[PDB]
Design a protein around this ligand. Structure first.
Ligand SMILES: CC(=O)Nc1ccc2c(c1)c(-c1cc(NC3CC3)n3ncc(C#N)c3n1)cn2CCC(=O)O
Ligand SMILES: [Cl-]
Length: 327
């Protein structure tokens, strides 16, 4: 009765063999320092639960990014902070440099290392075959590291990957939707951003894992090597799954759904239709041939699969023939 259970193939019991203080973020005590050390310079934007500023560390004058939290659930704040502190110093993980409060207004804020980013709609067109393989390997390091530390990012997308192209420096950012992996846990599927949602999220399969980040990465990789942003462009969560099925086909979807005994919402049977599995070559053309290779396509193919257990892990990925020219 109910969905078939599932476990992560890798780093399954990493939180289980650690003490509660590592993953029990609700018992985390947060110390808020003084924000006077930083001077707001420019509104960058208005992230989901925050406003974000370029700031300046008055003391050393080094550049910084300040995320001023809207009033959010104390619980989520502690999660993000605890996750950031556990992953700090890890490869290509953004550094939580400080946690502070404005003395007068009391609004909490997280302060991060600054990356001199090129917007991904300017950057991605510039990128060569070598570039894409390099930066994908940098992302993979961040995801292997963070999966090994018991954590799923759950919001992998071009917006959360900061690239200083001059310095070939990449940072995986915004850990606000990240969560700790506990095998057996039935999680909230209202995560990631639409275009990067894995089919497990869309069919409401809750016992998901690190392999969610591997789907999202694939979506990014497809958009990059094919020059089509976003790759899967759905008008909502239901239609998102239709956009995937028009590429991966309907037969492997229904076989995935039956295998896990997933109860498909009735909205799907009207819209899903019947679609064959398309070859990845169908997407290759004169303007992107130079970024595609047999290896690129094989790597992509082993990321973008319905069955999350069958996707490459981030370690398996880093060993793929696609990365040989970089490693
Ligand atoms: C800070 C965070 O966790 N999320 C977040 C949310 C919105 C953000 C940013 C980060 C950055 C952002 C920008 C840069 N750099 C660009 C040159 C200014 N850097 N660099 C490091 C981080 C971090 N963390 C960072 N975050 C810009 N925006 C505005 C996006 C929008 O409104 O569309
Ligand atoms: Cl959540």
């Amino acid at each position: 009765s109910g969905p078939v259970p599932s476990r992560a193939r890798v780093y399954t019991d990493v939180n289980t063999h650690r003490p509660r203080e590592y993953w029990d973020y609700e018992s985390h005590v947060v110390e808020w320092g003084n924000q006077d050390d930083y001077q707001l310079v420019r509104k960058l934007g208005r992230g989901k639960y925050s406003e974000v500023f370029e700031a300046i560390n008055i003391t050393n004058n080094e550049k910084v990014v300040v995320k001023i939290l809207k009033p959010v659930k104390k619980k989520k704040i502690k999660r993000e902070i605890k996750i950031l502190e556990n992953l700090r110093g890890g490869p290509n993980i953004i550094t939580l440099a400080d946690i502070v409060k404005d003395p007068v207004s009391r609004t909490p804020a997280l302060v991060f290392e600054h990356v001199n980013n090129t917007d991904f709609k300017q950057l991605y067109q510039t990128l060569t075959d070598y570039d894409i393989r390099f930066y994908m390997y940098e992302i993979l390091k961040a995801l292997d590291y963070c999966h090994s530390m018991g954590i799923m990012h759950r919001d992998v997308k071009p917006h959360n990957v900061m690239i200083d192209h001059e310095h070939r420096k990449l940072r995986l950012i915004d850990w606000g939707l990240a969560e700790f992996y506990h095998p057996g846990q039935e999680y909230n599927v209202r995560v990631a951003s639409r275009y990067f949602k894995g089919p497990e999220l869309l069919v409401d399969y809750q016992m998901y894992d690190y392999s969610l980040d591997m789907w999202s990465l694939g979506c990014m990789l497809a958009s990059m090597i094919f020059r089509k942003e976003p790759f899967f462009h759905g008008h909502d969560n239901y239609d998102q799954l239709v956009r995937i099925a028009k590429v991966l086909g309907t037969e492997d979807l229904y076989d995935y759904i039956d295998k896990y005994n997933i109860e498909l919402d009735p909205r799907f049977n009207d819209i899903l239709g019947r679609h064959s599995r398309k070859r990845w070559e169908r997407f290759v053309h004169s303007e992107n041939q130079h970024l595609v290779s047999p290896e690129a396509l094989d790597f992509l193919d082993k990321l973008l699969r319905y069955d999350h257990q069958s996707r490459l892990t981030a370690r398996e990925a880093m060993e793929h023939p696609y990365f040989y020219t970089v490693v």
